[PDB]
Amino acid sequence: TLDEYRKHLEKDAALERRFQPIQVAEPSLPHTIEILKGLRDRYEAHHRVSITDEALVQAATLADRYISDRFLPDKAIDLIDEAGSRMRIRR
Amino acid sequence: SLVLDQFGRNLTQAARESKLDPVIGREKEIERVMQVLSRRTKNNPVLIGEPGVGKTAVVEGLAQAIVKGEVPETLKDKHLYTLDLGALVAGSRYRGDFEERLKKVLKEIRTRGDIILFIDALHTLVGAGAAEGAIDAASILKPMLARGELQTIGATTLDEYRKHLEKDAALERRFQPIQVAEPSLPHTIEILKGLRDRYEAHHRVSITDEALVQAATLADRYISDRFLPDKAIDLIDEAGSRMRIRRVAEVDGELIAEVLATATGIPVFKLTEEESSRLLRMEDELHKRVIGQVDAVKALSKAIRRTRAGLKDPKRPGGSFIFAGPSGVGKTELSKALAEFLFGDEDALISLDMSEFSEKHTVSRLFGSPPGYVGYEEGGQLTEKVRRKPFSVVLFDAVEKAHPDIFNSLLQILEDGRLTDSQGRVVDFKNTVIIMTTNLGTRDISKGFNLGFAAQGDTKSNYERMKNKVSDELKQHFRPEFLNRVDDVVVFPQLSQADILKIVDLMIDKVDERLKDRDMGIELSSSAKELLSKKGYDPVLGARPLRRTIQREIEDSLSEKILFGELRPGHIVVVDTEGEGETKTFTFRGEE
Ligand SMILES: Nc1ncnc2c1ncn2[C@@H]1O[C@H](COP(=O)(O)OP(=O)(O)OP(=O)(O)O)[C@@H](O)[C@H]1O
Ligand SMILES: Nc1ncnc2c1ncn2[C@@H]1O[C@H](COP(=O)(O)OP(=O)(O)O)[C@@H](O)[C@H]1O
Ligand SMILES: [Mg+2]
């Protein structure tokens, strides 16, 4: 992470010199929707439920808009996982 | 030499096999190293220097000179062995195992007198042995080093030399330090020319002289946290790897520029026709979001074009602007539009709300706490953001509402393009665009005349009077040295009726997007737009009263209709006007 890179890895300049940093940026909304579409199969298999495309779009949009403490790819998956668990316990 | 080969590596043998890269232009350092080595009492040189300047390269060049070429007497046919110091510690569980290995190595070295030791990372020599019953390597080596019975070479950086070697003054006094300075630009060019053959052979490509020159110049100018030889070598190697993977292959300037731009994000790649055409139409692209304010758009476009054309001063930021004007005219909207045009959206802007910097002791939020104070390790807040994104737009909103001392910290930003945090690190600002927004000298826009008798009247429009007032207030509020560093001061005139009529379309489009979020839509007639423009228009308060009027006259009715149930998904609403004169009102009709 950026904080760990600055706080710890930069205290040893000789070790930090031997690495080439690469920036991994937070994905945009369409990229998050594609990721959710990709992981829908695995999450449906684990939770024994079915997820609609509208559910993925709503999860991505709502996570991007309202939840502001984390970053997009994870907080969108969290809503889907929580919904799956809530639906599973109801049986 | 079996015991030496078990816990070390023969550098001279490797140099005889051409397994070491050539060393260019280090004659003075090698000469001084040999001169120190051929001493009588303390012949132990240590090379201290910044990481990546070529400290190990000096030792490798000395080994190559010993193997082939001319070296002074007492150094003819000497074997230079690198002591890894990691194998000695390994496998020494029982008491007196590290000491036995060290004593055996020293005895072999004394027996075979043509041996010179090299110990990379000399700071690790302190406390080599573990706790309990053990004698560390430094204390064992001290007597031989003091008397000159063991020629050795060390290499460290300044940080751990001052941090570890200087703690043990007794061991520190036995070594003669030699400074290794970072090479200049022509020396780096010569080094690149020397290593070109090896890198071309490894990557099976061809590298031009212009490629080396461009790599050296760009690495010197744009990369900040590294040092010149390593930066240039990394650029050349990565460009060669990229071209090899793409597949005679040839590496030239544009590939180096593209690699650097991809690595850092600063736009330095070669200009194409499409990008040039896009840059020549920057004003038209920006006007899609900002109505009016032609002068500010021209200034911003000129600054961006000058930056991209290659005529920017390489020691100052790309541009510095003071946007002064009344409320609700588009000062922040223009900055957001510029950010969206530049990177991908208004979310990439670096915005500071100067209303929080009311007290002069808040300036630490730009630098960080000094050493020995809470929050010292966290560093600065602006410095970190700029360092993690060298090419960005920095905005200071409502500059007049902060204490008139925080901006004393902007001087070095606006003239030298740099800022130092409390930890001593320098973060450059040479690729940023600085915008400072204010409404100073705009309190008298709704003024008719001045006190006292006067014949005829002021023929100057509001723009000229407001410009003079802004200039006077700016000179009154800021120091002359701060205003002498600002590239441009742009005054924003008020909006006219046509500007409001045009902004109505953008606001209606935003409302339409909000409605379409729920699968709906809204369409207005020309009469509706004209009525909305007429109802909300105040020359003093800008385009915010238009927003309030739009919300009151449209959104309340739309919410009432949606909650009731008349408007449902799959339907669109059409807004028209009824009545005449001052009794004209709006009518909403549903439609599929
Ligand atoms: N020239 C303009 N073109 C388009 N929209 C505008 C323009 N001026 C103002 N607006 C609208 O009015 C809103 C408020 O204006 P804005 O935030 O740009 O004001 P400002 O000039 O920064 O003033 P303040 O001194 O109040 O900060 C904008 O978000 C935009 O919707
Ligand atoms: N004088 C020089 N001639 C050729 N190459 C050099 C020279 N100095 C440094 N280099 C190159 O710089 C690279 C890294 O240098 P390095 O030996 O790691 O320095 P340090 O040991 O101080 O970190 C090496 O691969 C080397 O090829
Ligand atoms: Mg504003």
mmCIF file of N, CA, C and O in Angstrom, chain A residues 1-85:
data_model
loop_
_atom_site.group_PDB
_atom_site.id
_atom_site.type_symbol
_atom_site.label_atom_id
_atom_site.label_comp_id
_atom_site.label_asym_id
_atom_site.label_seq_id
_atom_site.Cartn_x
_atom_site.Cartn_y
_atom_site.Cartn_z
ATOM 1 N N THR A 1 0.831 -1.190 0.000
ATOM 2 C CA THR A 1 0.000 0.000 0.000
ATOM 3 C C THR A 1 0.873 1.250 0.000
ATOM 4 O O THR A 1 2.067 1.206 0.305
ATOM 5 N N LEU A 2 0.262 2.383 -0.353
ATOM 6 C CA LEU A 2 1.018 3.628 -0.432
ATOM 7 C C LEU A 2 1.545 4.048 0.936
ATOM 8 O O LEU A 2 2.707 4.455 1.061
ATOM 9 N N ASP A 3 0.708 3.952 1.972
ATOM 10 C CA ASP A 3 1.143 4.334 3.312
ATOM 11 C C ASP A 3 2.271 3.440 3.805
ATOM 12 O O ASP A 3 3.260 3.926 4.365
ATOM 13 N N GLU A 4 2.144 2.126 3.604
ATOM 14 C CA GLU A 4 3.206 1.214 4.012
ATOM 15 C C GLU A 4 4.459 1.401 3.167
ATOM 16 O O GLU A 4 5.575 1.241 3.673
ATOM 17 N N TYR A 5 4.296 1.728 1.884
ATOM 18 C CA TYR A 5 5.452 1.997 1.036
ATOM 19 C C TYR A 5 6.220 3.217 1.525
ATOM 20 O O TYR A 5 7.456 3.209 1.564
ATOM 21 N N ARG A 6 5.505 4.278 1.901
ATOM 22 C CA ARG A 6 6.176 5.498 2.338
ATOM 23 C C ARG A 6 6.771 5.345 3.733
ATOM 24 O O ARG A 6 7.901 5.779 3.981
ATOM 25 N N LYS A 7 6.027 4.734 4.657
ATOM 26 C CA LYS A 7 6.458 4.708 6.051
ATOM 27 C C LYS A 7 7.625 3.755 6.269
ATOM 28 O O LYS A 7 8.587 4.096 6.965
ATOM 29 N N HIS A 8 7.564 2.558 5.690
ATOM 30 C CA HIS A 8 8.515 1.498 6.000
ATOM 31 C C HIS A 8 9.518 1.234 4.888
ATOM 32 O O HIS A 8 10.725 1.202 5.144
ATOM 33 N N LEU A 9 9.051 1.036 3.654
ATOM 34 C CA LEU A 9 9.958 0.636 2.582
ATOM 35 C C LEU A 9 10.944 1.740 2.222
ATOM 36 O O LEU A 9 12.026 1.451 1.699
ATOM 37 N N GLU A 10 10.602 2.996 2.491
ATOM 38 C CA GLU A 10 11.482 4.110 2.165
ATOM 39 C C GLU A 10 12.499 4.408 3.259
ATOM 40 O O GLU A 10 13.326 5.309 3.083
ATOM 41 N N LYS A 11 12.462 3.684 4.377
ATOM 42 C CA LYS A 11 13.505 3.807 5.386
ATOM 43 C C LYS A 11 14.770 3.048 5.012
ATOM 44 O O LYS A 11 15.802 3.237 5.664
ATOM 45 N N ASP A 12 14.712 2.201 3.989
ATOM 46 C CA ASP A 12 15.865 1.472 3.470
ATOM 47 C C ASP A 12 15.981 1.831 1.993
ATOM 48 O O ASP A 12 15.405 1.163 1.133
ATOM 49 N N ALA A 13 16.727 2.902 1.705
ATOM 50 C CA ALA A 13 16.833 3.385 0.333
ATOM 51 C C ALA A 13 17.514 2.370 -0.574
ATOM 52 O O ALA A 13 17.163 2.262 -1.754
ATOM 53 N N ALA A 14 18.487 1.624 -0.047
ATOM 54 C CA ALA A 14 19.181 0.631 -0.862
ATOM 55 C C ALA A 14 18.227 -0.456 -1.341
ATOM 56 O O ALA A 14 18.314 -0.906 -2.490
ATOM 57 N N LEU A 15 17.313 -0.895 -0.475
ATOM 58 C CA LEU A 15 16.350 -1.915 -0.875
ATOM 59 C C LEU A 15 15.289 -1.338 -1.806
ATOM 60 O O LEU A 15 14.885 -1.991 -2.775
ATOM 61 N N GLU A 16 14.826 -0.118 -1.527
ATOM 62 C CA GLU A 16 13.818 0.507 -2.376
ATOM 63 C C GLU A 16 14.356 0.799 -3.771
ATOM 64 O O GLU A 16 13.585 0.840 -4.736
ATOM 65 N N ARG A 17 15.669 0.997 -3.898
ATOM 66 C CA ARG A 17 16.255 1.303 -5.198
ATOM 67 C C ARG A 17 16.082 0.157 -6.186
ATOM 68 O O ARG A 17 15.981 0.391 -7.395
ATOM 69 N N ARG A 18 16.030 -1.081 -5.696
ATOM 70 C CA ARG A 18 16.045 -2.262 -6.548
ATOM 71 C C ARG A 18 14.653 -2.697 -6.993
ATOM 72 O O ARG A 18 14.483 -3.844 -7.421
ATOM 73 N N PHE A 19 13.660 -1.817 -6.908
ATOM 74 C CA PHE A 19 12.304 -2.133 -7.327
ATOM 75 C C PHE A 19 11.763 -1.024 -8.216
ATOM 76 O O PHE A 19 12.087 0.154 -8.037
ATOM 77 N N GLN A 20 10.933 -1.412 -9.179
ATOM 78 C CA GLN A 20 10.296 -0.465 -10.084
ATOM 79 C C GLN A 20 8.828 -0.323 -9.714
ATOM 80 O O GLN A 20 8.045 -1.258 -9.944
ATOM 81 N N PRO A 21 8.406 0.804 -9.141
ATOM 82 C CA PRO A 21 7.009 0.931 -8.713
ATOM 83 C C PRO A 21 6.050 0.952 -9.893
ATOM 84 O O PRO A 21 6.363 1.478 -10.964
ATOM 85 N N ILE A 22 4.873 0.369 -9.682
ATOM 86 C CA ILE A 22 3.797 0.361 -10.666
ATOM 87 C C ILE A 22 2.519 0.803 -9.968
ATOM 88 O O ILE A 22 2.174 0.276 -8.905
ATOM 89 N N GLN A 23 1.820 1.763 -10.565
ATOM 90 C CA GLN A 23 0.606 2.315 -9.979
ATOM 91 C C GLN A 23 -0.598 1.473 -10.379
ATOM 92 O O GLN A 23 -0.839 1.247 -11.568
ATOM 93 N N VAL A 24 -1.350 1.015 -9.383
ATOM 94 C CA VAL A 24 -2.609 0.312 -9.600
ATOM 95 C C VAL A 24 -3.723 1.260 -9.183
ATOM 96 O O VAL A 24 -3.865 1.583 -7.997
ATOM 97 N N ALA A 25 -4.515 1.707 -10.151
ATOM 98 C CA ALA A 25 -5.541 2.706 -9.904
ATOM 99 C C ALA A 25 -6.880 2.049 -9.597
ATOM 100 O O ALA A 25 -7.149 0.916 -10.005
ATOM 101 N N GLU A 26 -7.716 2.775 -8.868
ATOM 102 C CA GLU A 26 -9.051 2.288 -8.551
ATOM 103 C C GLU A 26 -9.887 2.216 -9.824
ATOM 104 O O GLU A 26 -9.919 3.184 -10.593
ATOM 105 N N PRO A 27 -10.565 1.101 -10.086
ATOM 106 C CA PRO A 27 -11.339 0.985 -11.325
ATOM 107 C C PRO A 27 -12.541 1.915 -11.337
ATOM 108 O O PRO A 27 -13.074 2.297 -10.294
ATOM 109 N N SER A 28 -12.963 2.277 -12.545
ATOM 110 C CA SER A 28 -14.132 3.121 -12.726
ATOM 111 C C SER A 28 -15.405 2.290 -12.584
ATOM 112 O O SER A 28 -15.371 1.085 -12.324
ATOM 113 N N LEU A 29 -16.552 2.950 -12.750
ATOM 114 C CA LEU A 29 -17.831 2.258 -12.606
ATOM 115 C C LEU A 29 -18.033 1.148 -13.633
ATOM 116 O O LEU A 29 -18.414 0.034 -13.231
ATOM 117 N N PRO A 30 -17.828 1.361 -14.942
ATOM 118 C CA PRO A 30 -17.996 0.235 -15.880
ATOM 119 C C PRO A 30 -17.054 -0.922 -15.605
ATOM 120 O O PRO A 30 -17.445 -2.087 -15.750
ATOM 121 N N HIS A 31 -15.815 -0.631 -15.203
ATOM 122 C CA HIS A 31 -14.880 -1.697 -14.865
ATOM 123 C C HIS A 31 -15.364 -2.484 -13.654
ATOM 124 O O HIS A 31 -15.250 -3.715 -13.615
ATOM 125 N N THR A 32 -15.910 -1.788 -12.655
ATOM 126 C CA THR A 32 -16.474 -2.471 -11.496
ATOM 127 C C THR A 32 -17.660 -3.338 -11.893
ATOM 128 O O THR A 32 -17.837 -4.442 -11.366
ATOM 129 N N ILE A 33 -18.489 -2.854 -12.821
ATOM 130 C CA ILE A 33 -19.621 -3.651 -13.289
ATOM 131 C C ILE A 33 -19.130 -4.909 -13.994
ATOM 132 O O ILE A 33 -19.684 -6.000 -13.807
ATOM 133 N N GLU A 34 -18.085 -4.781 -14.815
ATOM 134 C CA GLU A 34 -17.516 -5.954 -15.475
ATOM 135 C C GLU A 34 -16.954 -6.944 -14.460
ATOM 136 O O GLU A 34 -17.126 -8.161 -14.605
ATOM 137 N N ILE A 35 -16.272 -6.441 -13.430
ATOM 138 C CA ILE A 35 -15.729 -7.314 -12.390
ATOM 139 C C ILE A 35 -16.853 -8.048 -11.666
ATOM 140 O O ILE A 35 -16.751 -9.250 -11.374
ATOM 141 N N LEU A 36 -17.937 -7.333 -11.354
ATOM 142 C CA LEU A 36 -19.080 -7.962 -10.700
ATOM 143 C C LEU A 36 -19.702 -9.029 -11.590
ATOM 144 O O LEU A 36 -20.087 -10.101 -11.110
ATOM 145 N N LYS A 37 -19.810 -8.753 -12.892
ATOM 146 C CA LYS A 37 -20.315 -9.759 -13.820
ATOM 147 C C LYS A 37 -19.417 -10.989 -13.834
ATOM 148 O O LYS A 37 -19.901 -12.123 -13.902
ATOM 149 N N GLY A 38 -18.101 -10.777 -13.778
ATOM 150 C CA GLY A 38 -17.181 -11.903 -13.763
ATOM 151 C C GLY A 38 -17.303 -12.757 -12.514
ATOM 152 O O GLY A 38 -17.275 -13.988 -12.590
ATOM 153 N N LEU A 39 -17.437 -12.122 -11.352
ATOM 154 C CA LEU A 39 -17.495 -12.848 -10.085
ATOM 155 C C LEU A 39 -18.903 -13.306 -9.713
ATOM 156 O O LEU A 39 -19.070 -13.993 -8.692
ATOM 157 N N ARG A 40 -19.912 -12.928 -10.506
ATOM 158 C CA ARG A 40 -21.277 -13.362 -10.230
ATOM 159 C C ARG A 40 -21.385 -14.879 -10.203
ATOM 160 O O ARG A 40 -22.096 -15.437 -9.363
ATOM 161 N N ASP A 41 -20.704 -15.564 -11.124
ATOM 162 C CA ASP A 41 -20.802 -17.019 -11.182
ATOM 163 C C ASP A 41 -20.303 -17.655 -9.891
ATOM 164 O O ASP A 41 -20.981 -18.507 -9.301
ATOM 165 N N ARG A 42 -19.122 -17.241 -9.427
ATOM 166 C CA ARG A 42 -18.568 -17.808 -8.202
ATOM 167 C C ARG A 42 -19.434 -17.482 -6.994
ATOM 168 O O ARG A 42 -19.657 -18.342 -6.131
ATOM 169 N N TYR A 43 -19.934 -16.246 -6.905
ATOM 170 C CA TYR A 43 -20.727 -15.892 -5.732
ATOM 171 C C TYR A 43 -22.082 -16.593 -5.738
ATOM 172 O O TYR A 43 -22.585 -16.988 -4.679
ATOM 173 N N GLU A 44 -22.683 -16.769 -6.917
ATOM 174 C CA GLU A 44 -23.907 -17.555 -7.016
ATOM 175 C C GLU A 44 -23.661 -19.003 -6.620
ATOM 176 O O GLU A 44 -24.479 -19.611 -5.919
ATOM 177 N N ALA A 45 -22.541 -19.577 -7.066
ATOM 178 C CA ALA A 45 -22.229 -20.957 -6.712
ATOM 179 C C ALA A 45 -22.045 -21.113 -5.208
ATOM 180 O O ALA A 45 -22.540 -22.077 -4.613
ATOM 181 N N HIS A 46 -21.334 -20.178 -4.577
ATOM 182 C CA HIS A 46 -21.098 -20.291 -3.140
ATOM 183 C C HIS A 46 -22.376 -20.064 -2.341
ATOM 184 O O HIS A 46 -22.658 -20.802 -1.390
ATOM 185 N N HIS A 47 -23.161 -19.051 -2.705
ATOM 186 C CA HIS A 47 -24.335 -18.680 -1.926
ATOM 187 C C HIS A 47 -25.594 -19.442 -2.319
ATOM 188 O O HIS A 47 -26.618 -19.295 -1.643
ATOM 189 N N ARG A 48 -25.542 -20.244 -3.385
ATOM 190 C CA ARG A 48 -26.683 -21.049 -3.827
ATOM 191 C C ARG A 48 -27.901 -20.178 -4.129
ATOM 192 O O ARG A 48 -29.035 -20.531 -3.800
ATOM 193 N N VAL A 49 -27.668 -19.028 -4.756
ATOM 194 C CA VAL A 49 -28.721 -18.092 -5.128
ATOM 195 C C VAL A 49 -28.474 -17.627 -6.559
ATOM 196 O O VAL A 49 -27.532 -18.063 -7.225
ATOM 197 N N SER A 50 -29.338 -16.733 -7.034
ATOM 198 C CA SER A 50 -29.229 -16.154 -8.365
ATOM 199 C C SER A 50 -29.235 -14.637 -8.255
ATOM 200 O O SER A 50 -29.999 -14.067 -7.469
ATOM 201 N N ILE A 51 -28.382 -13.988 -9.043
ATOM 202 C CA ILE A 51 -28.198 -12.543 -8.997
ATOM 203 C C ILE A 51 -28.518 -11.967 -10.369
ATOM 204 O O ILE A 51 -28.029 -12.469 -11.388
ATOM 205 N N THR A 52 -29.334 -10.920 -10.392
ATOM 206 C CA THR A 52 -29.703 -10.241 -11.625
ATOM 207 C C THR A 52 -28.670 -9.179 -11.987
ATOM 208 O O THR A 52 -27.884 -8.729 -11.151
ATOM 209 N N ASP A 53 -28.680 -8.782 -13.263
ATOM 210 C CA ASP A 53 -27.789 -7.718 -13.714
ATOM 211 C C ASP A 53 -28.124 -6.396 -13.035
ATOM 212 O O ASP A 53 -27.224 -5.622 -12.678
ATOM 213 N N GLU A 54 -29.418 -6.116 -12.858
ATOM 214 C CA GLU A 54 -29.826 -4.907 -12.155
ATOM 215 C C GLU A 54 -29.282 -4.881 -10.736
ATOM 216 O O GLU A 54 -28.925 -3.812 -10.230
ATOM 217 N N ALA A 55 -29.201 -6.042 -10.082
ATOM 218 C CA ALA A 55 -28.622 -6.094 -8.745
ATOM 219 C C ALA A 55 -27.160 -5.668 -8.762
ATOM 220 O O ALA A 55 -26.723 -4.894 -7.902
ATOM 221 N N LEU A 56 -26.391 -6.150 -9.741
ATOM 222 C CA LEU A 56 -24.987 -5.762 -9.840
ATOM 223 C C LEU A 56 -24.841 -4.272 -10.118
ATOM 224 O O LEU A 56 -24.002 -3.597 -9.508
ATOM 225 N N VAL A 57 -25.648 -3.742 -11.041
ATOM 226 C CA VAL A 57 -25.558 -2.322 -11.371
ATOM 227 C C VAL A 57 -25.905 -1.471 -10.156
ATOM 228 O O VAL A 57 -25.213 -0.490 -9.846
ATOM 229 N N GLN A 58 -26.979 -1.832 -9.450
ATOM 230 C CA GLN A 58 -27.372 -1.088 -8.260
ATOM 231 C C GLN A 58 -26.300 -1.164 -7.183
ATOM 232 O O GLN A 58 -25.991 -0.158 -6.538
ATOM 233 N N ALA A 59 -25.721 -2.349 -6.973
ATOM 234 C CA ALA A 59 -24.675 -2.488 -5.968
ATOM 235 C C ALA A 59 -23.487 -1.597 -6.295
ATOM 236 O O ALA A 59 -22.994 -0.861 -5.433
ATOM 237 N N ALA A 60 -23.033 -1.627 -7.550
ATOM 238 C CA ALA A 60 -21.889 -0.810 -7.939
ATOM 239 C C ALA A 60 -22.186 0.674 -7.758
ATOM 240 O O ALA A 60 -21.394 1.407 -7.151
ATOM 241 N N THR A 61 -23.336 1.130 -8.259
ATOM 242 C CA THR A 61 -23.657 2.553 -8.193
ATOM 243 C C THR A 61 -23.808 3.022 -6.751
ATOM 244 O O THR A 61 -23.264 4.065 -6.365
ATOM 245 N N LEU A 62 -24.543 2.263 -5.935
ATOM 246 C CA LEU A 62 -24.770 2.663 -4.552
ATOM 247 C C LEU A 62 -23.479 2.638 -3.746
ATOM 248 O O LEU A 62 -23.237 3.537 -2.931
ATOM 249 N N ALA A 63 -22.636 1.621 -3.949
ATOM 250 C CA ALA A 63 -21.362 1.576 -3.242
ATOM 251 C C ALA A 63 -20.474 2.744 -3.642
ATOM 252 O O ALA A 63 -19.791 3.332 -2.795
ATOM 253 N N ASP A 64 -20.466 3.098 -4.930
ATOM 254 C CA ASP A 64 -19.666 4.235 -5.369
ATOM 255 C C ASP A 64 -20.186 5.544 -4.786
ATOM 256 O O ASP A 64 -19.397 6.422 -4.421
ATOM 257 N N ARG A 65 -21.509 5.694 -4.688
ATOM 258 C CA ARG A 65 -22.068 6.994 -4.329
ATOM 259 C C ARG A 65 -22.115 7.213 -2.820
ATOM 260 O O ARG A 65 -21.692 8.265 -2.329
ATOM 261 N N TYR A 66 -22.624 6.240 -2.066
ATOM 262 C CA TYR A 66 -22.971 6.471 -0.668
ATOM 263 C C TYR A 66 -21.886 6.053 0.313
ATOM 264 O O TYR A 66 -21.588 6.803 1.247
ATOM 265 N N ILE A 67 -21.288 4.879 0.137
ATOM 266 C CA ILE A 67 -20.247 4.412 1.045
ATOM 267 C C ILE A 67 -18.935 5.070 0.635
ATOM 268 O O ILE A 67 -18.357 4.728 -0.399
ATOM 269 N N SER A 68 -18.455 6.019 1.444
ATOM 270 C CA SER A 68 -17.157 6.651 1.201
ATOM 271 C C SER A 68 -16.300 6.495 2.455
ATOM 272 O O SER A 68 -16.161 7.419 3.257
ATOM 273 N N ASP A 69 -15.727 5.305 2.609
ATOM 274 C CA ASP A 69 -14.563 5.074 3.457
ATOM 275 C C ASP A 69 -13.570 4.109 2.832
ATOM 276 O O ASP A 69 -12.420 4.053 3.280
ATOM 277 N N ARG A 70 -13.966 3.370 1.797
ATOM 278 C CA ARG A 70 -13.160 2.326 1.183
ATOM 279 C C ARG A 70 -13.073 2.578 -0.315
ATOM 280 O O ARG A 70 -13.395 3.677 -0.779
ATOM 281 N N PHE A 71 -12.645 1.581 -1.083
ATOM 282 C CA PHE A 71 -12.430 1.755 -2.510
ATOM 283 C C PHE A 71 -13.321 0.814 -3.309
ATOM 284 O O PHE A 71 -13.812 -0.199 -2.804
ATOM 285 N N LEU A 72 -13.511 1.171 -4.580
ATOM 286 C CA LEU A 72 -14.651 0.678 -5.352
ATOM 287 C C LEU A 72 -14.707 -0.837 -5.511
ATOM 288 O O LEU A 72 -15.774 -1.416 -5.245
ATOM 289 N N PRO A 73 -13.652 -1.535 -5.948
ATOM 290 C CA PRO A 73 -13.819 -2.970 -6.244
ATOM 291 C C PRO A 73 -14.237 -3.806 -5.047
ATOM 292 O O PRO A 73 -14.969 -4.788 -5.220
ATOM 293 N N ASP A 74 -13.811 -3.446 -3.837
ATOM 294 C CA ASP A 74 -14.115 -4.268 -2.670
ATOM 295 C C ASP A 74 -15.493 -3.951 -2.099
ATOM 296 O O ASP A 74 -16.287 -4.861 -1.831
ATOM 297 N N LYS A 75 -15.790 -2.666 -1.896
ATOM 298 C CA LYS A 75 -17.050 -2.279 -1.272
ATOM 299 C C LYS A 75 -18.258 -2.640 -2.126
ATOM 300 O O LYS A 75 -19.360 -2.790 -1.585
ATOM 301 N N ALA A 76 -18.084 -2.782 -3.440
ATOM 302 C CA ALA A 76 -19.185 -3.243 -4.279
ATOM 303 C C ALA A 76 -19.431 -4.733 -4.087
ATOM 304 O O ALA A 76 -20.583 -5.179 -4.044
ATOM 305 N N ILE A 77 -18.358 -5.518 -3.974
ATOM 306 C CA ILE A 77 -18.490 -6.951 -3.736
ATOM 307 C C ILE A 77 -19.068 -7.218 -2.351
ATOM 308 O O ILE A 77 -19.773 -8.216 -2.143
ATOM 309 N N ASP A 78 -18.773 -6.345 -1.385
ATOM 310 C CA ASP A 78 -19.266 -6.544 -0.026
ATOM 311 C C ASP A 78 -20.788 -6.536 0.022
ATOM 312 O O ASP A 78 -21.396 -7.337 0.741
ATOM 313 N N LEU A 79 -21.424 -5.632 -0.729
ATOM 314 C CA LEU A 79 -22.882 -5.583 -0.747
ATOM 315 C C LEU A 79 -23.472 -6.871 -1.306
ATOM 316 O O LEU A 79 -24.437 -7.412 -0.753
ATOM 317 N N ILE A 80 -22.900 -7.377 -2.401
ATOM 318 C CA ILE A 80 -23.389 -8.617 -2.996
ATOM 319 C C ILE A 80 -23.233 -9.775 -2.019
ATOM 320 O O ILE A 80 -24.145 -10.595 -1.852
ATOM 321 N N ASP A 81 -22.076 -9.859 -1.358
ATOM 322 C CA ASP A 81 -21.845 -10.952 -0.417
ATOM 323 C C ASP A 81 -22.797 -10.874 0.771
ATOM 324 O O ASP A 81 -23.335 -11.896 1.215
ATOM 325 N N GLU A 82 -23.013 -9.668 1.303
ATOM 326 C CA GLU A 82 -23.933 -9.507 2.424
ATOM 327 C C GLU A 82 -25.357 -9.871 2.026
ATOM 328 O O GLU A 82 -26.075 -10.522 2.793
ATOM 329 N N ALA A 83 -25.785 -9.458 0.830
ATOM 330 C CA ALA A 83 -27.117 -9.821 0.360
ATOM 331 C C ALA A 83 -27.249 -11.329 0.198
ATOM 332 O O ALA A 83 -28.276 -11.913 0.563
ATOM 333 N N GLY A 84 -26.218 -11.976 -0.350
ATOM 334 C CA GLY A 84 -26.256 -13.421 -0.486
ATOM 335 C C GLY A 84 -26.358 -14.129 0.851
ATOM 336 O O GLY A 84 -27.137 -15.071 1.006
ATOM 337 N N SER A 85 -25.577 -13.679 1.838
ATOM 338 C CA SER A 85 -25.643 -14.285 3.164
ATOM 339 C C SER A 85 -27.007 -14.067 3.811
ATOM 340 O O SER A 85 -27.562 -14.983 4.436
#
